[PDB]
Structures are given as C-alpha cells and as structure tokens.
Write a protein that binds this ligand. Structure first.
Ligand code: NA
Ligand code: ZN
Length: 305
C-alpha cells in the first residue's frame, strides 16, 4: 500500500503529486509557494504531506524537486526563486517535521528521472534527459536513480562550450555568445528556445520568436527550412561530443522546443557523422511526461535505495 509523494517546488506554486507503487498518479494538489518566511514554507509542504497521509491512510515517502542547489555539503539549500527556503537545511528540517527521509534533487534531474521511469524506458540502463526550452539542461539516470554528481552539476549540458566542429559547420567567425554563467560560447545560448530565435535573426535579420519560425516552417517557408536545417546540424554536432563521453542508451528530449517534432524525428540521421565509427546512436525520443514530470521525478527519488 506504499505511496510515493512528489513535490515540484517552483517560484509560484508547490505542486504535490501522489503515486501508487505502480507509478500511476492518484491525486494532485497545488498551493502558492510562500515567500514570506521559512516557517510558512515548511508548513505549506508539511500540511500537504499530512493531508495525503490522511487521505490514503499511509505514511507516503517524500521527494522534492528544487530549481537550484538542493543540498550543499553542509546540508543547505539554495534557490533563487525560493527565497523562503534558501540558506536553510530544508532536507533535515522537513525530515524531522515528517519523521521520514525527505529526499531532494534539482528540477532537471527530476525531469530526467520522470522520463527514465516511463513504462517503456525502464528497459534502458543509462538515460540522458535533455531539456531544450527556456534554457538548456538535463540529467543522467542510471538504473532508475539520478546521477547527481558532487554538486548537482551532472547534466548541465547547456554550460559546455561549443566544440570546434561547430565552427567548421558555422564558420570560424560564428559569434561566441556570452552566457549568464560568465563563459563565452556555452551551447545553451544557441540551443535553447531563445538560442533558436537568435540563430534565425543572425542569418535573416528579422526578430521572430520560436513559435513564429515554427509556424513558417509548417507553411513551408524556405528561410524557416534553411534555419531549421542549421539548428538541427548544430544540435547534432554539440550532441556528438556529449554522447561520445556519456554513451547513453536513450536520449529523451524535453522542454518547449521538444514540442517541435522535427527536433526528435530528424536528429538521429545526423548523429553518426559525429560519433565514433563503432558507436551506435542512442534511441532518441520526445519527452512523454511534460506537465507531470516535476512531480513524477521528485516522487521517484524513492524508487531506489
Ligand atoms: Na495556510
Ligand atoms: Zn554558460
């Protein structure tokens, strides 16, 4: 009768999803994220766990996805959009309040874990989740457990510089854009939704956003088509480098751009030219649990020891 609770904590709302032992969602509830004080934040979360416990007559396990640093070396959380909890030992405090092992991970790792636990995808030991949306990020999952790395940096694909073969493709004068992290040329600024739009403007001198370019592509516009071919080629070159070091069985692509089917259907054929001769491309799939993934991944933190 084990139940798995998963919280997706964002700047606006705290979303709880409750899953049974077969990973099916049984109940959902969302409340506003308190920003006023840590005590109000702790209560928002604990009251939801208590409500679920009462509703299902069980002590559910509790997993939580955080957009930031879940637990530093000393046990401290840091998240820009969750000021009420930042600087606090969230994991320890919630664990004491709920008398159970509350587990935390970042939102990109929860996204990857949610996909790795899709019924069909559990057959793949090593799953790489790639998010192409507001930013670029992701995570790595091995045998159903996320690989967090020393500081929850594993899977920060958006912050690896363009490889030199991107200059061979685009020209050596291709702009190396300044990233928010401070480096020059991070792939996030070419492959995110904004990067996709920037690349269009770079070639065509028109300020269209991704939806608009996609609309033109669907209507058969020649520029939009030429733009998408370049984007896909650049995505492939960048992925060639990542896949050569990670070698995942499955690459699942999520985020806003993943709704553009060309990104997951026309990518596989472009990979072999950037992979080792003896390498096989990973299976490539569009994410299957967009909306519910934050809650699923958080809940799934308790599916492994
Ligand atoms: Na209240
Ligand atoms: Zn960067």
């Amino acid at each position: 009768n084990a139940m798995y609770y998963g919280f997706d904590i964002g700047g606006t709302k705290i979303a709880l999803g409750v899953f049974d032992s077969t990973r099916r969602l049984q109940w959902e509830k969302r409340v506003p994220t308190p920003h006023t004080s840590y005590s109000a934040f702790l209560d928002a979360v604990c009251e939801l766990v208590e409500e679920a416990d009462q509703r299902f007559g069980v002590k559910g396990s509790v997993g939580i996805g955080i957009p930031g640093m879940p637990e530093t070396e000393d046990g401290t959380l840091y998240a820009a959009n969750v000021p009420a909890a930042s600087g606090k030992p969230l994991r320890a405090d919630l664990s004491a309040r709920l008398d159970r092992d509350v587990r935390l991970d970042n939102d990109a790792n929860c996204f990857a874990l949610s996909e790795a636990w899709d019924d069909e995808f559990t057959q793949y030991p090593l799953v790489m989740g790639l998010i192409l949306g507001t930013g670029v990020g992701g995570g790595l999952v091995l045998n159903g457990k996320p690989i967090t790395g020393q500081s929850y940096i594993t899977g920060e694909f958006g912050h690896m510089r363009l490889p030199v073969d991107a200059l061979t493709l685009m020209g050596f004068d291709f702009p190396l854009r300044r990233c928010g992290c401070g480096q020059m040329g991070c792939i996030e600024n070419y492959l995110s939704g904004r990067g996709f739009a920037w690349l269009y403007q770079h070639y065509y001198d028109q300020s269209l956003q991704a939806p608009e370019i996609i609309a033109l592509w669907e209507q058969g516009d020649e520029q939009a088509h030429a733009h998408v071919e370049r984007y896909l080629d650049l995505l492939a070159v960048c992925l060639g480098n990542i896949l050569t070091i990670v070698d995942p069985d499955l690459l699942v692509i999520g985020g806003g751009l993943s709704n553009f089917t060309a990104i997951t259907t026309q990518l596989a054929e472009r990979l072999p030219r950037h992979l080792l001769p003896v390498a096989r491309a990973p299976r490539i799939e569009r994410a299957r649990h967009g909306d519910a993934g934050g809650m699923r991944g958080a809940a799934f933190l308790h599916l492994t020891d």
